[PDB]
Amino acid sequence: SSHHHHHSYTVTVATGSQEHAGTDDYIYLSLVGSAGCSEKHLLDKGSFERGAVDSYDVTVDEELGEIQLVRIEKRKYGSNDDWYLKYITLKTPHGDYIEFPCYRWITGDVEVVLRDGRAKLARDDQIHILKQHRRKELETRQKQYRWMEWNPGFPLSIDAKCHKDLPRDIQFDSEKGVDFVLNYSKAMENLFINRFMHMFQSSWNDFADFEKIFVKISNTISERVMNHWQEDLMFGYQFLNGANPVLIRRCTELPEKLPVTTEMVECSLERQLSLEQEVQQGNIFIVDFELLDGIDANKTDPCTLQFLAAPICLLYKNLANKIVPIAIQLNQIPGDENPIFLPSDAKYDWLLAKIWVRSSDFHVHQTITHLLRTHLVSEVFGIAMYRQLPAVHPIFKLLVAHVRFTIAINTKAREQLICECGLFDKANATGGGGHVQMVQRAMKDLTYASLCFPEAIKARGMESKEDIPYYFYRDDGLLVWEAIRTFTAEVVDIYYEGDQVVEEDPELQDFVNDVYVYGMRGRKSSGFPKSVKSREQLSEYLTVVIFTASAQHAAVNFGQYDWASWIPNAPPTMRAPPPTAKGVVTIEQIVDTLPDRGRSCWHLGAVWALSQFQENELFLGMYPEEHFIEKPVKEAMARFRKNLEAIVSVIAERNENLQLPYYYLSPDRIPNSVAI
Numbered sequence: 001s002s003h004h005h006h007h008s009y010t011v012t013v014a015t016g017s018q019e020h021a022g023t024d025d026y027i028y029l030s031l032v033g034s035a036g037c038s039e040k041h042l043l044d045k046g047s048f049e050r051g052a053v054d055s056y057d058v059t060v061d062e063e064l065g066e067i068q069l070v071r072i073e074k075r076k077y078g079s080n081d082d083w084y085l086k087y088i089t090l091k092t093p094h095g096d097y098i099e100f101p102c103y104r105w106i107t108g109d110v111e112v113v114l115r116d117g118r119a120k121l122a123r124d125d126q127i128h129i130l131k132q133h134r135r136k137e138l139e140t141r142q143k144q145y146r147w148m149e150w151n152p153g154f155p156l157s158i159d160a161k162c163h164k165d166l167p168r169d170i171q172f173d174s175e176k177g178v179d180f181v182l183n184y185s186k187a188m189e190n191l192f193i194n195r196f197m198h199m200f201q202s203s204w205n206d207f208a209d210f211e212k213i214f215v216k217i218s219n220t221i222s223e224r225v226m227n228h229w230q231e232d233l234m235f236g237y238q239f240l241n242g243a244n245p246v247l248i249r250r251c252t253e254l255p256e257k258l259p260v261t262t263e264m265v266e267c268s269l270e271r272q273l274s275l276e277q278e279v280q281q282g283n284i285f286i287v288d289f290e291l292l293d294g295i296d297a298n299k300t301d302p303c304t305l306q307f308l309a310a311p312i313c314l315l316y317k318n319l320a321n322k323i324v325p326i327a328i329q330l331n332q333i334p335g336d337e338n339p340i341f342l343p344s345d346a347k348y349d350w351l352l353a354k355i356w357v358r359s360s361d362f363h364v365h366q367t368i369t370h371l372l373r374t375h376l377v378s379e380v381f382g383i384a385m386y387r388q389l390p391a392v393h394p395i396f397k398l399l400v401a402h403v404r405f406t407i408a409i410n411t412k413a414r415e416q417l418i419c420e421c422g423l424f425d426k427a428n429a430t431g432g433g434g435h436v437q438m439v440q441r442a443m444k445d446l447t448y449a450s451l452c453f454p455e456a457i458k459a460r461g462m463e464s465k466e467d468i469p470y471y472f473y474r475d476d477g478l479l480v481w482e483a484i485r486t487f488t489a490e491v492v493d494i495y496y497e498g499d500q501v502v503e504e505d506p507e508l509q510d511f512v513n514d515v516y517v518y519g520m521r522g523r524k525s526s527g528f529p530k531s532v533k534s535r536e537q538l539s540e541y542l543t544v545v546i547f548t549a550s551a552q553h554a555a556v557n558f559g560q561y562d563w564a565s566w567i568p569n570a571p572p573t574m575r576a577p578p579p580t581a582k583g584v585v586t587i588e589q590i591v592d593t594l595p596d597r598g599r600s601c602w603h604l605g606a607v608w609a610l611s612q613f614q615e616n617e618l619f620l621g622m623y624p625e626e627h628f629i630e631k632p633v634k635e636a637m638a639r640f641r642k643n644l645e646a647i648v649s650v651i652a653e654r655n656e657n658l659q660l661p662y663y664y665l666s667p668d669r670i671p672n673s674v675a676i
């Protein structure tokens with residue numbers, strides 16, 4: 001893979017490994033020294049092939065001094081062969097070895113100009129050559145990466161209508177590599193379900209009819225779900241360790257809108273305390289779907305009415321310290337057509353009440369927990385990073401690995417999935433616009449504090465491991481949060497000698513300010529910082545960014561097939577309204593309320609496709625793109641990787657004693673960024 005060209009500097013040029021990384025176009029290189037610039041040098045005609053390392057001897061007509069910049073210019077040979085340049089290194093006549101990180105796609109359209117890889121704040125740059133490069137880099141970034149309002153009240157996102165319109169630097173490696181249209185359909189073939197793809201008016205004949213399809217495609221967890229989804233324990237388990245474990249709260253007072261009494265739930269209580277006494281002891285929990293109240297249901301199929309609820313589910317920590325459901329009201333305002341269902345009800349009344357809660361959990365999961373609170377948030381940070389932090393800045397070098405492919409996957413989603421008449425409308429009862437309404441309503445509670453994982457856990461009253469022992473999302477989340485916090489605090493400490501340097505960093509300030517003003521729409525109640533004035537505040541902010549993009553996304557994304565493939569445990573839609581009376585519903589009715597065959601197919605393809613890892617996925621703390629080249633930061637990265645490996649072992653030992661292992665937050669399964 002290594003080609004040495006001999007006719008002085010030795011210039012090493014490293015081409016990417018991605019499929020189309022290579023180029024046959026003319027490549028010119030110049031060196032900018034403090035004492036002068038070199039000539040433009042055509043690097044020996046030929047092809048920089050995928051994965052290539054080419055070395056060239058380059059003799060200069062004059063002494064240049066310390067090399068400050070390297071300039072690359074791609075000129076056309078034949079047609080446009082985009083080029084992925086990983087890095088350039090220099091061995092100088094004076095014997096020094098200088099690395100210039102790039103990690104960028106180079107189209108013929110503009111010269112690329114690189115600093116050496118030592119990280120620099122603006123205050124480090126005092127000579128004109130460097131100040132001009134830095135300022136021009138930011139001017140160009142701010143023309144190429146612009147903010148846009150895709151839907152009213154949303155966090156602002158990238159100003160591009162489709163993926164092909166993005167700057168090449170932030171596109172996927174290919175145009176059809178990661179594609180919702182192609183991958184959802186590919187999923188339905190691999191899952192063997194393609195004959196039913198568009199059968200949107202046909203119910204399953206019974207549970208057995210769907211089981212026949214499911215058993216061929218189940219995995220370990222989803223097979224357990226199929227066998228156990230009717231159990232109260234399995235239903236309650238998911239609020240702590242399922243796909244959406246972020247909603248449950250410790251109840252400190254029973255809400256007036258839920259007129260439940262001790263007599264109603266006395267059979268569930270196990271301590272000879274009244275319900276009001278259980279509340280006060282900390283044994284009562286609540287999941288409250290107020291956000292779904294008044295969301296429009298999908299009306300895009302006139303032959304299929306679809307329906308949403310907005311339930312309140314009351315839960316109890318029993319004598320085994322397991323949290324189990326004790327009461328379910330399917331809508332927000334109580335009354336005689338909004339019954340409080342109970343585990344003492346007729347079998348299928350209580351089962352259906354639980355299905356409605358699971359369906360509601362799925363809706364909030366897809367649109368709020370996952371899309372808004374990890375995808376759109378991560379994209380806000382990535383756009384702000386590109387607009388305001390030059391590539392030589394240490395926070396750019398730190399964060400660029402954690403926003404990889406984020407704008408690309410979100411733009412594909414707005415292009416194909418969640419746009420009007422996109423794929424999301426096919427199976428989901430919030431399709432057709434209710435999902436946009438939910439985002440608008442959740443925005444008003446997307447706060448900074450809600451992204452600070454320890455505080456957010458405490459805000460829900462769920463922090464006590466002694467009182468609430470089987471919350472593995474919490475336990476693993478806290479360890480990973482602290483690992484990132486430790487890593488970011490060290491990086492900050494290397495490059496920022498004190499708080500005044502943080503406060504005076506104009507690019508950092510503009511980064512934070514773009515997130516507040518554009519990303520968060522300038523809402524004071526968001527609690528986002530308008531500026532950052534200390535090293536500790538910066539460390540916490542960078543942890544919010546990285547944790548949201550890696551750990552939080554992984555926890556809520558990669559258990560989607562596990563928990564939602566068995567459709568009764570997570571219906572994407574319901575084809576009858578919630579039951580208004582006890583003693584009526586039958587199992588046959590439930591079958592006809594659950595998704596039709598077509599919606600089931602699209603749902604399974606979607607949760608399968610979205611739960612996949614890539615063959616060379618980058619997991620947390622894997623940084624093959626060496627933006628950082630300096631020894632102190634590389635030692636910080638090594639300590640990060642060691643802290644993470646210790647967490648892997650903690651989780652592995654914990655999981656061996658568990659009925660259902662919880663592994664979404666094992667760091668060896670957490671990708672660096674939102675990329676799917």
Ligand SMILES: [Fe+2]
Nearest residue numbers: 553557674676
């Ligand atoms: Fe995702």
